[PDB]
Design a protein around this ligand. Sequence first.
Ligand SMILES: NC(=O)c1ccc[n+]([C@@H]2O[C@H](COP(=O)([O-])OP(=O)(O)OC[C@H]3O[C@@H](n4cnc5c(N)ncnc54)[C@H](O)[C@@H]3O)[C@@H](O)[C@H]2O)c1
Ligand SMILES: NC(=O)c1ccc[n+]([C@@H]2O[C@H](COP(=O)([O-])OP(=O)(O)OC[C@H]3O[C@@H](n4cnc5c(N)ncnc54)[C@H](O)[C@@H]3O)[C@@H](O)[C@H]2O)c1
Lengths: 268, 266
Amino acid sequence: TTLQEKIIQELGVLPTIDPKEEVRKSIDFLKAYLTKHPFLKTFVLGISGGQDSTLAGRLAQLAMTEMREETGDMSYQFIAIRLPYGEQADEADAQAALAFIQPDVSLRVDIKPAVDAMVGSLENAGVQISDFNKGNMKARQRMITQYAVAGENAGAVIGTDHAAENVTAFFTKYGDGGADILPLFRLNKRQGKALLKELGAPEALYLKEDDKPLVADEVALGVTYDAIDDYLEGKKVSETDQQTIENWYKKGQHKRHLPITIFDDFWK
Amino acid sequence: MTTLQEKIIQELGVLPTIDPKEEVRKSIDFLKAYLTKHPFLKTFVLGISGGQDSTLAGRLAQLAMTEMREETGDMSYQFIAIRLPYGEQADEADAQAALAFIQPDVSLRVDIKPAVDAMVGSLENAGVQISDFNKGNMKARQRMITQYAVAGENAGAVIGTDHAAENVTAFFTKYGDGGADILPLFRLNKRQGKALLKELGAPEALYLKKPLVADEVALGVTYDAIDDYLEGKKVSETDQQTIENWYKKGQHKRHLPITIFDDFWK
Ligand SMILES: NC(=O)c1ccc[n+]([C@@H]2O[C@H](COP(=O)([O-])OP(=O)(O)OC[C@H]3O[C@@H](n4cnc5c(N)ncnc54)[C@H](O)[C@@H]3O)[C@@H](O)[C@H]2O)c1
Ligand SMILES: NC(=O)c1ccc[n+]([C@@H]2O[C@H](COP(=O)([O-])OP(=O)(O)OC[C@H]3O[C@@H](n4cnc5c(N)ncnc54)[C@H](O)[C@@H]3O)[C@@H](O)[C@H]2O)c1
């Protein structure tokens, strides 16, 4: 077996899916977890306006709607949290997703006071935080907010990690990677778009002739989501793009595992 | 068929008897071997509170960095210790005695209370009251953010203090003090942690000490019973039930976020 075949097996990506069936697989998986853990009543997720948190939010809300209808228990709710950095941050994209999700609870918590206070307390010790590190600080502060809300409403924190993000470890360790359950895990980027299309999401929520332009995530990675998805579907990509993808994989192995103990061997 | 006690001991890798001198080497060599395999890592980062776990983990990381410098001649290999108090009223005497024994390369002090209080204010601003217990987990996560911020600036890895006696009961905050990069103490119980601290020449005020300890009061079971359990001995039916109940409740803390492919929760 090759590294590509192994990575595909590890992430459980299928070269082709049934988007209608995958939506049911995602929802039934969520519902099955609630039933086995009666102490869990709510689902919490930060809604950023992006494809991932929109799809994971809709699947979470659809799960809770079925739960409270099957069980009659009205405690089953999904809580959406808008987590802007600052008070003049554009939230048009976020509430466009909110209109599609239709969450039972819609909250807004500004993370700028906490992040700025933590940055200041760090500068008080000679630690100046770079621009990119501050981004990781924002993702971890958003992790704290979602877990603070779940810690009050007997909830579980939904995670937006999927296959295309996991190969590249394109997430903040214990930031957006810090969550309780992963409804999107197994799907690549374009497969996530297919599920959003299956759920009747307005086309402006996953998209935005000549070549398609690049998004911020692809500029950082040096490889497009189409190559990443082709790779995870078992298709042959260029030697250059394959090297980029597998380099990100080995680079982010520590994010794909629990904290490293003396018994681990994956890193050697 | 194998007991749950045997599975847990195998899973956590506890030994009924250890060699404290050898176990000191096994942790130091493990930390150095990871740095050697990852030349982009140059520092270790750990919050120092004064307790047994962070003191033993801090000394082991500091010792490993000293050997790293002497073997390679690269002076950038440093251990960074951060005092992470909540406010000013918090007593510093116990954390100070830990730093006197560790003698770190870099000693920082970051107060998490401004960030934590701002988080609470923004949450209460949205109608979310925060209880004292939920606020406790928020402090452990804010401390995690501080440590990873320092590590993100210094090409560092965050040292974790989780051990066997803490993993059975899952007595840590998910992505709080449980969020770390490398666990030098994983396999040791609570008393084995004391034994290594003795081997390392730590003063007895750091690990020796009927009075009530806060951990055992919340856990409903003593550390001596947890350590007897992890050493393969037989414990009372009451204590065995208490421990195994914590183990099943904290299974989600011992695994990555749940995917559709997992079955341990079923
Ligand atoms: N140029 C960019 O666009 C850019 C820059 C920085 C970060 N990001 C994004 O932030 C997120 C994470 O980036 P990040 O990795 O820089 O921050 P991160 O906090 O998620 O990961 C780095 C941390 O993990 C630990 N670590 C690093 N190497 C380790 C190793 N071999 N073993 C064990 N622990 C190790 C360290 O504690 C380090 O601080 C991603 O989504 C990334 O796309 C993007
Ligand atoms: N009386 C006390 O002394 C006391 C009380 C509470 C907490 N604590 C301390 O805080 C530490 C953390 O414990 P905690 O549970 O209160 O906070 P925690 O954040 O570590 O665990 C609770 C969170 O984990 C998630 N979760 C809970 N059950 C889950 C499940 N079955 N599946 C998936 N996710 C689940 C939820 O997001 C929940 O909000 C404790 O170990 C203890 O050290 C002490």
